[PDB]
């Protein structure tokens, strides 16, 4: 909806906390949140009717948004796919849909990766732009074992309106991301 | 092969060049003929 | 080592970019007449100098053979010859500094660069140091 719980926690605690943290000079100077993209590599276009677009519906039922099949730009013969077409799944989540996806992610999904000592806070590096992978895709609160055939590990990238990495660090760590120290 | 569109049981071969393995097989193109303007013009 | 070459004779005309100064080292052979300096004459003069002042200093060959000198194998005329009889040739115009020796004293440098000029087909000058410069 419009009153996402994580969105409310952002708008009521985190923006004045980052203001009273860094000594900002504008309400829009605080790092906002604008992008959570989910990529699915998925080089699987062999014979014997290898459809494998069930994972598109799987990702759509996770997020709440139907991902697009993205055709490969360059054709390389090392992995045998070629000539553009076959597979790569991308979904891009902006406002309240991104917020309900992060409500499903940060509180329900990561707390669970099979060990999960934390995230990797060397991963921002210069832009806003925190990227993080997922080995096992079914940590999410929708899909257990009896809805798939194989393991479909995606990788998300959340982009902030933060110029450096310290600013997005301080944003996402209070939005609810844990880290490794 | 070099195939010519005929006005439908009529005149006016329209003389295109098809690429027969890639699609052909009732090549259908609206075309302006010599007589009775505009038609369907299936090939050959 | 690259783009297609059995290239033409050109013509060894006027020399301005063909000849500026001595940059590396101290002393320098410098040509006084346009001629084709082969790779064989480059190696011949250089192993004259390095064996003259033995285990010596630096001998910068500022020219480089980059022109396929072509020789027909003693027959009539059907196309270009087979190319590269001794190999490639540095097109050298006069005023060009060909060799520079570095650091080694004047008594070895003047009796080394003279040997290099004796194995080269060009009447040469030998310059000492303190040429064209630019820095403030």
């Amino acid at each position: 909806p419009l009153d996402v719980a994580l969105k409310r926690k952002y708008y009521e605690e985190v923006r004045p906390e980052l203001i009273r943290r860094f000594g900002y000079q504008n309400v829009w100077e605080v790092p906002r949140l604008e992008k959570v993209v989910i990529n699915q590599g998925l080089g699987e276009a062999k014979e014997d009717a290898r459809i494998l677009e069930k994972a598109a519906q799987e990702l759509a039922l996770i997020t709440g948004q139907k991902p697009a099949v993205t055709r490969a730009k360059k054709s390389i013969s090392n992995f045998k796919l070629r000539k553009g077409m076959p597979i790569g799944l991308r979904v891009t989540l902006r406002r309240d849909r991104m917020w309900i996806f992060l409500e499903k992610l940060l509180n329900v999904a990561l707390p669970r990766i099979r060990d999960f000592r934390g995230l990797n806070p060397n991963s921002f590096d210069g832009r806003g732009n925190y990227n993080l992978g997922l080995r096992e895709q079914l940590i999410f609160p929708e899909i257990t074992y009896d809805m798939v055939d194989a393991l479909r590990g995606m990788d998300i990238a959340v982009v902030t309106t933060a110029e450096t990495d310290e600013e997005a660090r301080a944003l996402l760590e209070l939005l609810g991301f844990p880290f490794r120290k | 092969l070099l195939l010519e569109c005929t006005e439908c049981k009529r005149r006016n071969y329209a003389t295109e060049k098809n690429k027969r393995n890639t699609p052909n097989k009732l090549e259908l193109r609206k075309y302006c003929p010599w007589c009775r303007k505009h038609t369907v013009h299936r090939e050959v | 080592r690259m783009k297609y070459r059995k290239q033409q004779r050109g013509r060894l005309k006027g020399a301005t970019k063909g000849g500026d100064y001595v940059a590396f080292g101290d002393y320098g052979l410098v040509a006084l007449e346009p001629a084709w300096i082969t790779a064989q004459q480059i190696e011949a003069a250089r192993v004259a100098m390095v064996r003259h002042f033995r285990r010596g200093g630096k001998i910068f060959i500022r020219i480089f053979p980059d022109k396929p000198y072509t020789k027909k194998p003693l027959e009539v005329r059907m196309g270009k010859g087979k190319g590269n009889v001794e190999g490639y040739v540095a097109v050298v115009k006069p005023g060009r500094v060909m060799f520079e020796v570095a650091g080694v004293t004047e008594e070895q440098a003047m009796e080394a660069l003279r040997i290099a000029g004796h194995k080269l087909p060009i009447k040469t000058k030998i310059v000492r140091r303190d040429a064209y410069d630019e820095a403030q």
């Binding site: 669970r112 099979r114 060990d115 096992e136 079914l138 940590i139 257990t144 074992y145 | - | -």
Partner: protein, 120 residues
């Protein structure tokens, strides 16, 4: 219902269904089912979710398992490959460690027999 890590058994008896969780074997699955208090012969296709979490509260909190255990096993191995204890060496090249002969045997620590041998 998954138990630990993600390791979910279905349609099996619970007291060997716990064994598919790494770190729980037959003996711990015998013990810490009636220890919590569950009839240990109820097929997990019908396991009450309150009993699932009353089982899981003993599974995760008591002893270390897949991940925190597995990784300590591997850390014990990397700790054994230190400067050269005799059990960390021969983990370092995969030979066996607790008194196994290797003249003919040891196909489960070696391979795939590389049969490049033989005289004339």
């Amino acid at each position: 219902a998954r138990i630990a890590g993600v390791e979910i058994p279905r349609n099996k008896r619970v007291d060997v269904a716990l064994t598919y969780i790494y770190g729980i074997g037959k003996a711990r699955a015998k013990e810490a089912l009636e220890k919590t208090g569950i009839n240990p012969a109820t097929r997990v296709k019908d396991l009450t979710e309150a009993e699932v979490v009353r089982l899981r509260e003993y599974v995760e909190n008591t002893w270390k398992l897949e991940g925190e255990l597995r990784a300590e096993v591997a850390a014990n191995i990397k700790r054994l490959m230190d400067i050269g204890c005799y059990r960390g060496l021969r983990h370092r090249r995969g030979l066996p460690v607790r008194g196994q002969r290797t003249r003919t045997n040891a196909r489960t620590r070696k391979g795939p027999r590389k049969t490049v041998a033989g005289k004339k």
